[PDB]
Ligand binder design. Structure first.
Ligand SMILES: [Ca+2]
Ligand code: NA
Length: 293
């Protein structure tokens, strides 16, 4: 586990997407932008994304899809009314910087705080909703699926505590969602693309005072979840066994993505220190659709 710092002075980094050349496109939630970090050290702003760009994934159209949580109040907190512009799913052209809003509601219900996302092999898009905190109450968590072609958005999970990381199993027959305040990883069986069948179960709950953020799946099927408070990556087996906890040095570790040769480098956002780091990983990551395979 040879650790290296790839970038600093990032304004709450999140949503890393590791390109084939080892460059990383990621979101800076506090600076409201999509940023490109190159292996020669240089950084460039790809696009300004007003609000709270929170997670990213490359899509079948070659554009970068974004979960926009609508803004926080800044460490993040509950957004004062004016700092919140509504949650949405957006798309960014990585060549022009043009930002287009795709969805801001599902049925008659506005999206609250979209958080992270993952494409299935048909181009359908899963995403979590962490909800928003208000003065005396908070939204429940949810997960959504957008049908291939971006034709329709559907609610698949609703009424958990806030949901954050999301991924698919290698065979894409199971969707995983991390429940932030409880440090529980939930597994949902899929009867087919985009469709949960009964709605799921927690396969792992960490002890102590530990909370979950975003995640990435390994080719083995293990789920690697960024763990807040204790500052590590929690590696969870498909059967829920806690395989290991890899310390990162930052209590606000928020996300992980695999890249490099054989997808055996982990790229991790340390959102407390404002850093993107890389770490050797003993097992290869699961290739993401429309990025790695
Ligand atoms: Ca997240
Ligand atoms: Na990730």
């Amino acid at each position: 586990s040879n650790v290296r710092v790839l970038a600093t002075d990032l304004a709450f980094p999140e949503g890393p997407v590791v390109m084939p050349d080892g460059s990383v496109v990621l979101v800076e939630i506090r600076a409201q932008q999509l940023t490109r970090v190159w292996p020669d050290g240089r950084k460039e702003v790809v696009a300004k994304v007003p609000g709270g760009p929170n997670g990213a994934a490359l899509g079948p159209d070659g554009k970068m899809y974004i979960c926009n949580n609508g803004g926080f109040g800044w460490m993040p907190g509950a957004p004062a009314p004016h700092e919140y512009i509504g949650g949405s799913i957006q798309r960014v052209d990585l060549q022009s910087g043009e930002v287009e809003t795709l969805f801001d509601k599902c049925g008659e219900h506005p999206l609250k705080g979209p958080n992270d996302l993952v494409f299935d092999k048909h181009g359908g898009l899963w995403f979590t909703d962490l909800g928003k905190r208000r003065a005396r109450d908070m939204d429940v968590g949810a997960a959504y699926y957008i049908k291939p072609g971006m034709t329709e958005i559907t609610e698949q999970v609703f009424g958990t505590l806030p949901l954050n990381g999301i991924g698919l199993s290698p065979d894409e027959a199971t969707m995983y969602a991390a429940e932030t305040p409880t440090g529980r990883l939930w597994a949902f069986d899929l009867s087919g693309p985009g469709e949960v069948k009964p709605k799921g179960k927690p396969i792992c709950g960490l002890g102590g005072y530990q909370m979950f953020d975003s995640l990435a799946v390994e080719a083995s099927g293990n789920v690697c979840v960024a763990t807040l408070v204790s500052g590590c990556i929690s590696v969870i087996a498909p059967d829920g066994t806690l395989v290991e906890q890899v310390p990162t040095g930052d209590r606000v570790t928020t996300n992980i993505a695999f890249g490099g040769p054989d997808l055996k480098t982990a790229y991790i956002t340390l959102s407390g220190k404002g850093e993107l780091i890389a770490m050797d990983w003993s097992r290869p990551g699961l290739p993401l659709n429309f990025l790695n395979k």
